[PDB]
Amino acid sequence: SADNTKLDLTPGESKNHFYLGIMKRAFRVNDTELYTLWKLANGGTNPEF
Amino acid sequence: LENAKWGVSQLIQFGNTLLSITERQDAEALAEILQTQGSELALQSIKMQ
Amino acid sequence: REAAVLQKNYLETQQAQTQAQLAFLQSKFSNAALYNWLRGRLSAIYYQFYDLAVSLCLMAEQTYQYELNNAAAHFIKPGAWHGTYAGLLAGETLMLN
Amino acid sequence: REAAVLQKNYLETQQAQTQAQLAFLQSKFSNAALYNWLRGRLSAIYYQF
Amino acid sequence: LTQLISFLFQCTQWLTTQKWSVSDVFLMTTDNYSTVLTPDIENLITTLSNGLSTLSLGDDELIRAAAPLIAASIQMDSAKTAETILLWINQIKPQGL
Amino acid sequence: LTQLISFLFQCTQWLTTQKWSVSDVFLMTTDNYSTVLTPDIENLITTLSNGLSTLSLGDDELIRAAAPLIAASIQMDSAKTAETILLWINQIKPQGLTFDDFMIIAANRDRSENETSNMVAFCQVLGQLSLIVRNIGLSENELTLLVTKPEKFQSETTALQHDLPTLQALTRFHAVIMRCGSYATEILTALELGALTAEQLAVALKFDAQVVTQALQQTDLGVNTFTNWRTIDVTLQWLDVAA
Numbered sequence: 223s224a225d226n227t228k229l230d231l232t233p234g235e236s237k238n239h240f241y242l243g244i245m246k247r248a249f250r251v252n253d254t255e256l257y258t259l260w261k262l263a264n265g266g267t268n269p270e271f
Numbered sequence: 272l273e274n275a276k277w278g279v280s281q282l283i284q285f286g287n288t289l290l291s292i293t294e295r296q297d298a299e300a301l302a303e304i305l306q307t308q309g310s311e312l313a314l315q316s317i318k319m320q
Numbered sequence: 321r322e323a324a325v326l327q328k329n330y331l332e333t334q335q336a337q338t339q340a341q342l343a344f345l346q347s348k349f350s351n352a353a354l355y356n357w358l359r360g361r362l363s364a365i366y367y368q369f370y371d372l373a374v375s376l377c378l379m380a381e382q383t384y385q386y387e388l389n390n391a392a393a394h395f396i397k398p399g400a401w402h403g404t405y406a407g408l409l410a411g412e413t414l415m416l417n
Numbered sequence: 418r419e420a421a422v423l424q425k426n427y428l429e430t431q432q433a434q435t436q437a438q439l440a441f442l443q444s445k446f447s448n449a450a451l452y453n454w455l456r457g458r459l460s461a462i463y464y465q466f
Numbered sequence: 467l468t469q470l471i472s473f474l475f476q477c478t479q480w481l482t483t484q485k486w487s488v489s490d491v492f493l494m495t496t497d498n499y500s501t502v503l504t505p506d507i508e509n510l511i512t513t514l515s516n517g518l519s520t521l522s523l524g525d526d527e528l529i530r531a532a533a534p535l536i537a538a539s540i541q542m543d544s545a546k547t548a549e550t551i552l553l554w555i556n557q558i559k560p561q562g563l
Numbered sequence: 564l565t566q567l568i569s570f571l572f573q574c575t576q577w578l579t580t581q582k583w584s585v586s587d588v589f590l591m592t593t594d595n596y597s598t599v600l601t602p603d604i605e606n607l608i609t610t611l612s613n614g615l616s617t618l619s620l621g622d623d624e625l626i627r628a629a630a631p632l633i634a635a636s637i638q639m640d641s642a643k644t645a646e647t648i649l650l651w652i653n654q655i656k657p658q659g660l661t662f663d664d665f666m667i668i669a670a671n672r673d674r675s676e677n678e679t680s681n682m683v684a685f686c687q688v689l690g691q692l693s694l695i696v697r698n699i700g701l702s703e704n705e706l707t708l709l710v711t712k713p714e715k716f717q718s719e720t721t722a723l724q725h726d727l728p729t730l731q732a733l734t735r736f737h738a739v740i741m742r743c744g745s746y747a748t749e750i751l752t753a754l755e756l757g758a759l760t761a762e763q764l765a766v767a768l769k770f771d772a773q774v775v776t777q778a779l780q781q782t783d784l785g786v787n788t789f790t791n792w793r794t795i796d797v798t799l800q801w802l803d804v805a806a
Contacts, residue, residue: 233773233777252774254771254773254774254777255771257773258771258773272380274376274379274380275373275376275377275379275380276415278369278372278373278376278377279373279376279377279411279414279415280411280415281369281373281411282366282369282370282373282410282411282414283411283412283415284411285362285365285366285369285411286366286407286408286409286410286411286412288362289359289362289363289366289406289408290408290447292355292358292359292362293355293359293406293446293447294447295355296352296355296356296358296359296447296640297445297446297447297640299345299350299351299352299355300352300441300445300640301438301441301442302345303342303345303346303351303352304437304438304441305438306338306341306342306345307342308434308437309338310335310338310339310342311430311434312427312430312431312434313331313334313335313338314335315423315426315427315430316331316334316427317328317331317332317335318423319420319423319424319427320324320327320328320331352638353638356634356635356638356639356640357606357610357635357636358635359635360631360632360633360634360635360636360639360642361610361614361631361632361635363631363635363642364614364628364631364632364635367631368616397516397519398516399512399515399516399517400516402458402509402512402513402516404505404509405451405454405455406446408451408455409455409458409459409462412458412459412462413458413462415466416462416465416466440700440741444700444702445640446640446641449541450541453537453538453541453542453543454509454513454538454539455538456538457534457535457536457537457538457539457542457545458513458517458534458535458538460534460538460545461517461531461534461535461538464534465519489766489769492766493745498762498766500749500753500758500763502749502752502753502756502758503752504748504749504752505704505748505752506748
């Protein structure tokens with residue numbers, strides 16, 4: 223469910239494995255790889271996901 | 272000056288000779304490694320026949 | 321089938337010929353071992369002869385500084401034995417100086 | 418099929434042999450880098466002389 | 467967004483036309499190089515240190531005296547290509563130098 | 564028993580990867596050489612006897628004066644590879660002989676049978692060295708790092724050995740260096756120092772910086788850089804298992 227739930231996309235500090243595993247399966251991406259995918263969309267930063 | 276000029280002309284002769292010897296060294300080493308690997312290919316081609 | 325047997329005999333002939341070329345290159349006098357010895361010996365001689373000839377150059381520089389009353393004349397620069405390229409072009413640099 | 422597998426092994430042997438010749442030419446003392454240095458240094462010496 | 471898509475497409479087609487990888491243009495383009503001092507840099511130091519004569523002046527004479535030696539150090543076949551490359555790097559000044 | 568089975572498997576796969584026989588590593592590794600005096604050894608004797616000048620002193624000047632002649636005798640293309648190989652054989656001393664006291668056994672021609680036996684032992688350990696360098700390929704920026712700084716090889720070593728596990732680790736070291744490609748001497752000179760980091764090994768081996776530092780975090784708790792080869796080997800194993 224696309225809920226407005228805050229989630230830290232840095233590869234060690236989420237511990238919300240359901241949403242993050244769904245993003246990894248949907249985007250065909252790792253932890254690190256999803257994190258740099260979010261850094262590209264914000265100019266090398268991660269404000270709040 | 273004539274004596275030092277003699278010694279340095281002889282050094283030039285030695286450096287030219289050393290360059291020729293090291294390039295003939297590398298040429299002969301290349302010929303040897305080509306023959307060894309051609310021998311390997313010949314054995315493998317007999318096994319294919 | 322007999323054509324294929326002749327082909328295998330041809331390939332074994334080529335194997336023996338490649339081995340003959342290899343044995344010729346191993347056993348020739350101008351093989352790679354002679355050039356290994358030859359450049360190692362000549363490299364030792366070349367470094368020691370570089371020491372001798374740069375000593376002769378500094379000797380000529382010293383009498384240049386004595387005749388023309390100029391003890392700060394420095395024509396023979398520290399260098400000219402670049403060790404990574406085996407000290408090649410040492411005599412060209414010293415003839416330049 | 419087994420003859421084709423031996424052919425592929427032969428081609429991989431040729432690939433490794435081409436890479437061995439390439440690594441020999443990169444790593445030899447009389448490679449192109451020595452001649453680059455050698456003609457640049459001798460070109461400087463030659464103009465001053 | 468459509469400008470960035472168009473840029474990525476023309477850059478990717480340029481890469482596959484030239485048969486270069488992204489790592490190739492990254493090696494040719496980046497600012498994220500390492501700052502460790504390499505024997506290539508050391509060879510440049512001692513070649514261009516011992517090879518250049520007494521102190522020369524800038525783009526008039528220094529760049530022409532040092533272009534054969536700096537084409538000797540890094541892999542070039544022409545000293546005049548090295549001279550115009552040093553003109554290029556003088557007008558760009560990597561980290562101010 | 565399962566450790567010996569694992570050793571035999573990894574050694575056999577290493578042999579068939581390098582395309583070496585057991586006889587090849589036996590020629591490169593053994594102590595069961597013959598002690599007979601060979602014309603190669605004789606050529607080494609007279610070349611390095613007549614070629615060296617008046618008496619020079621040890622690892623300061625003797626090893627540098629004799630490295631071109633000993634690269635002339637046994638098959639080498641570079642005198643500096645010969646110099647670091649003589650440094651290696653000085654710190655290992657086959658049958659007690661350094662390169663000092665091998666010079667004294669040479670240039671005698673009045674020497675005893677045990678004396679010439681130790682001489683032949685020194686010359687054939689030099690031959691095992693020349694093979695162990697030319698069969699894997701070690702271009703002396705790769706080799707004098709491990710001879711002079713064996714702490715950069717493994718943190719326990721403190722003297723590079725003539726073992727078979729050391730030979731296999733030299734193979735893996737050479738393989739990762741040649742895998743680094745254009746950045747290889749840059750990785751080597753960063754490993755000379757303690758400056759080999761992530762964002763540098765990751766670019767050279769085409770990994771990601773965060774994955775490389777994340778595996779370095781698994782082999783080392785808080786070490787920022789790669790200060791050793793063993794940490795690079797095990798962090799590449801972490802990268803392989805994660806990949």
